[PDB]
Amino acid sequence: GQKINPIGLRVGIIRDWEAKWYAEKDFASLLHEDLKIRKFIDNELKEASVSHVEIERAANRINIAIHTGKPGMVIGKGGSEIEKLRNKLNALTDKKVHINVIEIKKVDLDARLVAENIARQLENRASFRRVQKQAITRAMKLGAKGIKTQVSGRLGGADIARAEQYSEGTVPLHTLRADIDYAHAEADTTYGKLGVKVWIYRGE
Amino acid sequence: TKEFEERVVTINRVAKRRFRFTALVVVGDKNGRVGFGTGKAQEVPEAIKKAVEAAKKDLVVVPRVEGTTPHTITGRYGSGSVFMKPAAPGTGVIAGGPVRAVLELAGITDILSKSLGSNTPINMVRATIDGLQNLKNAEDVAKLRGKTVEELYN
Amino acid sequence: MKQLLEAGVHFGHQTRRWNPKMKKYIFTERNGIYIIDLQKTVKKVDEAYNFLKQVSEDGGQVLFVGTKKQAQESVKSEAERAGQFYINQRWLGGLLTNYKTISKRIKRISEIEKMEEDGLFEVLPKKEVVELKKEYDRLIKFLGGIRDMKSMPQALFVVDPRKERNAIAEARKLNIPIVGIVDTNCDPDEIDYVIPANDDAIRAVKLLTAKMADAILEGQQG
Amino acid sequence: MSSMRAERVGEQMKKELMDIINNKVKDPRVGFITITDVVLTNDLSQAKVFLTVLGNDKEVENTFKALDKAKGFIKSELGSRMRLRIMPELMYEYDQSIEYGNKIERMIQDLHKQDR
RNA sequence: CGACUUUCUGGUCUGUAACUGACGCUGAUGUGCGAAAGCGUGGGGAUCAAACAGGAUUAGAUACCCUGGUAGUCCACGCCGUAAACGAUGAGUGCUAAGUGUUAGGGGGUUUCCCGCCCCUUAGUGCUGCAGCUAACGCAUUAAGCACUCCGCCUGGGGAGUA
RNA sequence: CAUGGUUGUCGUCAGCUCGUGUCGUGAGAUGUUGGGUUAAGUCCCGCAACGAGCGCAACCCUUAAGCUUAGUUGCCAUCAU
Structure with missing residues (x-):
């Protein structure tokens, strides 16, 4: 088209990818698993207005970092809600996760x-x-x-x-x-x- | 710097279509200073602000005698003629729309006025402002000539 | 102050047209060239001298403009010696007073001279410097009134009102005093303090600017 | 881009133009006995004049540098003469067809030489 | 109103200014002049050319183009009395920055000498431009500026320059 | 022809605008006109009109010469095979 989303061209030059994992021919499984977490993100989106998430795949562990609009209740009073989010994600993706919430700029x-x-x-x-x-x-x-x-x-x-x-x-x-x-x-x-x-x- | 009263005279969406809003605004302290400005923008409050800023740059100093003009005058600006003459206290500002606006906003409490010829508001306001600025106060008239007050006055 | 002999050093004026409202100030027309009367010129020079000394006594700020050729470097030297800013090129509309978004221009030159100090040449590729340096010199040249003023004209100096109609018009609109060299065909009404000197007399121009700089110096010292 | 009307305007403009250029352009010291031919656009705003001069490659240039000044007089008188509404701008150019046609006759020698 | 000569004759401008001593300005009614076309009586008639004749062009062409050509264009005496008859600016007078051409003069200076040039000035005729005026365009000492005098004329467009 | 989102075509056509002084009673103008110059609204001169933004270019990648790091599965100057 006339105008295309510029962050498509920007990525790979100065900025990192939206989703990151190790490279192999089994990319279909990784992408179809990541789509489930991406769709699940809406639950935290509807209350915290998280901008976007960078997801990382370690040797056997998954690391994510959400850009919430305010960290106070996404982290909870003393961690009253992060554990259940981790458990729900573990159940949904059939694999554990390492949530690292960082407040947006x-x-x-x-x-x-x-x-x-x-x-x-x-x-x-x-x-x-x-x-x-x-x-x-x-x-x-x-x-x-x-x-x-x-x-x-x-x-x-x-x-x-x-x-x-x-x-x-x-x-x-x-x-x-x-x-x-x-x-x-x-x-x-x-x-x-x-x-x-x-x-x-x-x-x- | 101090408080000034503003009021709109005409808002018009005028075309060339890049038709946007143009504002006629009179700005006066109601204690002897008045001025008008014109501004053009895309939104009405911005046009009003531009007109007010333009008006504040050119402020007349109307000579004051007990809330009325020292003498009769007739402003003129390109077929914009308006005649205003002083009146006794309690007469009320008898004047038309733009003329009344500028007169009250200048501090005038009671005069007799009448526009002559063109009724276009911009020309009417420029006429009234010209008439107000070429008023002559008695004290400086006495000083301008060699004489003094208390021998000839109103 | 002023020396009568230095007045006699100055001579003549251009003769192509003249303001007939100045026609009383001509001493005696001869050789087909209008000449000025130095007697009242000395008086006006003295009154401008003491006025500028008084203004600079309280901290007055006066600009120096050099739009005309054959006098630019003289005006620049005069400005640097006097401790004031300069106009080394064409005078734009509101070039001095930071109302016509020339503050953006001066901020731009400041940032593009500070980033190079922080590192801009041979740290970023040539593909950006080829345009950034070009723009920097462009704004140096076009921004002939590159100044350190705080959008505070206060007063001004005009060397030739014929070329500085813009400067004198903006000065009148801003209600700031005008004083400077005024030739045989410039309007004296629009200028508060008129000094009837010539424009082709370059050495007389240099002497006059040195005199106003000495006035500003005496004002600033005490 | 051409109509019969443009042709009539060209012919009647040629007749008057030759007359004026050789009977009223005094001031240019380089007057020249010229022949002419004129063409115009369909809208009569543009007109091309083609002419011949006698002299060297500095006399044609002097005559052109004289025609360039005289264009005002020509346009004034021409508008004062003809009924046409809009004066077409006029530029003067040599009729190169004269020399080209002469060169066109030149190879005739070659055809007759080889067959003889 | 442009060939030249002669005869008769009107107006204007410059300098001096002793001469009359306000004799001036405007001007309804009135009476004359008044482009071109046109009318009457005659004369003349080379060119040109309404009408008219033919040809060409065109969907059509009565027109533009071409070939001819009468009235007329010309003269004498009458009539007609109109024009985008225009500076679309009534006449008279006085005042109000300048610059620069040009026509007819006058005076002064310089130069041995004006055949040169420069300065000053009067009366026309142009261009550019202040103040000022105009709705603008523009005018601006040849005002459309500032004033006074007198005359003519206007009061929405059409109907209507009609009855 | 209720639309978002996405995509074609003019078309890599060379244009599209805005703030600001400050011209004009005003609608508007201006900048963006004129001259040289470029395929380009690209550069310069003048310009009470000025100043600024999107767009063009550059920025990206490949390649075209080379230097440094690195030689394996690849290469073979010197070698044996």
Whole structure:
């Protein structure tokens, strides 16, 4: 297509892969097992808005690291909920796991977090325009070299598929030394689907 | 620096279509200073802010006599003629929309006014501002000429 | 102050057009070239001298502009000696006062000169330096008013108002005093302190700038 | 890109153009007895004039450097003469077909030489 | 209103200024002049050319193009009295920055000498431009600026320059 | 022809814009026009109009010369086989 998710080209040059394990011809089993944990992630997504997870496969152990929106209750008061998450994952993937929760970068300047935020804000019957203004305001307040959020679909309870963009600063896409964070989200209340792609440009 | 009162005179989405909002805003302290500005943007509050900032840069100093003009005047700006004359206390600001806006926002409490000719709000406001800025106060008029006050006055 | 002989060293003015509202200030037209009266020029030079000394006494800040040829280096030397900033190239609209996003320009030059100190040449490939150095010198040249000002004009110096109509217009809009060399065909109304000197008289220009620098020096010392 | 109308405009413009260039362009010291031929676009905004000169490769250049100045006068008078609405811009170019056609006659010698 | 000569004749400009001493400005009604076309009586008629004739072109061409050609174009005396008759700017007067051409003069300076040049000035005729004016375009000492005098004219478009 | 997401075509066509002074009563202009120059809105000059962003390029990879590390299953200067 005209525009392709840039993090597809970015990976393998400056940034690591979403999922990582040892190389062998039995990649089908590893990928079909990883898909189960990826689909299971939604349970923690719906309450902690975890951006993404890097999963590692040791000699016989599995290491993951979630980027939660807040670590306080994902780690629990004193570890009241991590053990049951580990047990559920062990049951589902038919293999144990080594959960290492790390809080996402303190500033809410990342991509998937704000993407889910604005998706839920739209689903809660709030003006996408005002939400975008707040998002870009706090984005430039926090300090970012470039940030744009696109939306598409039937906005504002309409029947017309229109698209909007609200960017700021220098945002080099064709440039490769950009170190960006492409995200996506889906939102609706009663009307179809409304996709949003948030782009973050932090440092070169 | 200090508090100023603002109010909108006309908001129009005007086309060339890259049609966006243009704002006519008068800004005055209601204690002897007033000014107007125009601003164009994509959202109404931003246009209002731009108009207010533009107005604050050019502030008139209307001479004051007991909340009315020292003398009669007639502002003119390109077919924008407006005639205003002072009035006794309690008369009320008799004026049209833009003229009333600028007059009250300048601190004027009671005058008699009437616009003549063009009723386009931008020209009307520029006319009123011109008329207000070319008022002459009695004390500096006395100083401007060789004379002094207490021999000739209002 | 000013020497009458140095006034007599200055002579002549360009004769292609003249402001007829200055026509009283001509001493005696001769040789087809308008010449100025040095008698009142000395008085105006003295009043500008003491005014600038007073302004610099309280910490006044005055710019020096060098847009015209054959005087740029003189103005630059004058600015560095006087302790003020310079305009070594064309004067842009609001080039001095950091309202027309020239603060972004000066910040950009600062960061691209600091990152090289932190390491930018032969640590990152040539493919980036070939453009970054080109941009850096581009902004050095085009940003002829590269300055260390705090968006505070206060006052200004204009060498030729014909080429600095922009500078004098912005000065009038900002209500800051104007004083400098004014030739035979410049408007004296728009300039608060007018010094009727010539433009082709390069040595007279250098002497005048040295005089204003001495004024600023006396102001800053006491 | 051509219509009969353009052809008539070209012919009637040629007739007047030859007249003016040789009877009213005094000031250029290099006047030359010229022949002409003119073509135009279908919309009559562009016109090409083709002509011949007598002299060397510095006299054709002097005459051209004189025609370049005179173009204003030519356009003024031409518009003052013809009913046409929009004055086409005029550029003057040598009719190379004269020398090319002459070179075209040259190889005729070769055909007659080998067969004789 | 452009060939030349002669006769008769109107206006304007410059310098001096002793001469009359406000004799001035505007101007309804009135009376004259008034491009071209057109009308009447005659004369002339080379070129050109409404109408008209033919040919060409075109889906059609009564038109543009070509071949001819009458009235007319020309002259004398009358009539007609209109024009995008325009600077689309009424006449008179005074004041208000400049720069630069050009026509007819006048004066001063320099130069031995003006045939040169420079300066000053009056009256036309151009261009560029301040203040100022205009809705803008633009005008700007030849104002569309600042003022006074007098005359003519306008009050939405069409109907209508009609009845 | 309710759409998200994804993809074609113009088309690697060379364009698309915005802030800011500050021109204009205003709609608007401007920057982005003009000159040289490039396949390119690429560079320079002038430009009260200026300044800035997306886009182009570069950034990536392969390859085209070479130097260093490393020689196995590969290679054979010197060797035997």
